[PDB]
């Protein structure tokens, strides 16, 4: 999952650039994508700060 | 040795006999006219029948597809940089980059990062 | 005697499969772990180049 997310963000960057989307639409997308991964990480381990 | 080729000889006997039978079968034949039509018709039906008949394991495929896309993207972008000495774009861009970055010994930076490489998050918290 | 021997064979007929089931998964987990670790390493080089 981590490897897929890492490539997904970079691949989406250029796709958004080519369409002329404003920075706010990119920032909201980045936050929304990060939130899903962070929530999913809560079950795939305790996320205990080790 | 002579006795270790017995199996090969026994298996090869059957090849010669068949080769002789085909000669006789073809020589005993103008029934070829009738014979050809059967195949000529069966081929079309066979072709028609064939035409009528015509977790982790997902993340891995997604990773592969996205990796191919990323490689493609880095290509077609390197090409413009290749022309830096001629375009004057990547010169007008380098001017802006330098102007904005002013707000070195490269070897020094690498050592500075390496000296605390594997403890950044531990030190931050 | 004959039915006792029959039962003896029946017992091992179950024990063998019960044994093999664990080892098959043991191999599969290692294979998947290696593949996932390679996939994780590809993205690092992708980001480094980008």
Automatic annotation (TrEMBL), chain A:
Q: What is this protein called?
A: Internal virion protein B
Give from-to of the shown chain within the full protein: 102 to 151 of 904
TrEMBL record, chain B:
Q: What is this protein called?
A: Putative internal virion protein
What is the phylogenetic placement of the source species in the record?
Viruses, Duplodnaviria, Heunggongvirae, Uroviricota, Caudoviricetes
What stretch of the whole protein does this chain cover? 1 to 168 of 204
């Amino acid at each position: 999952a981590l490897a897929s997310f890492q490539l997904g963000l970079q691949n989406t960057a250029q796709q958004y650039v080519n369409s002329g989307k404003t920075p706010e639409e990119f920032n909201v997308h980045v936050q929304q994508q990060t939130n899903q991964l962070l929530q999913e990480a809560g079950a795939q381990g305790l996320n205990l700060n080790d | 040795m002579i006795w270790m080729f017995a199996a090969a000889a026994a298996q090869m006997i059957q090849g010669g006999l068949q080769y002789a039978q085909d000669a006789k079968n073809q020589r005993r034949q103008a029934d070829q006219k009738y014979n050809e039509a059967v195949r000529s018709a069966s081929a079309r039906q066979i072709t028609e029948i064939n035409t009528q008949r015509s977790s982790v394991e997902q993340n891995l495929q997604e990773v592969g597809v996205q990796l191919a896309a990323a490689e493609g993207n880095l290509m077609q972008n390197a090409e413009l940089t290749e022309l830096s000495l001629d375009s004057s774009v990547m010169n007008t861009v380098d001017q802006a980059r330098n102007s904005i970055r002013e707000l070195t010994d490269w070897a020094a930076t690498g050592s500075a990062v390496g000296q605390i490489g594997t403890s950044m998050v531990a030190n931050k918290l | 005697k004959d039915w006792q021997a029959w039962l003896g064979s029946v017992e091992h007929s179950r024990n063998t499969a019960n044994a093999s089931y664990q080892d098959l998964n043991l191999k599969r987990a290692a294979v998947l772990q290696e593949q996932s670790w390679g996939a994780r390493g590809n993205a690092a080089i992708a980001d480094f180049v980008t």
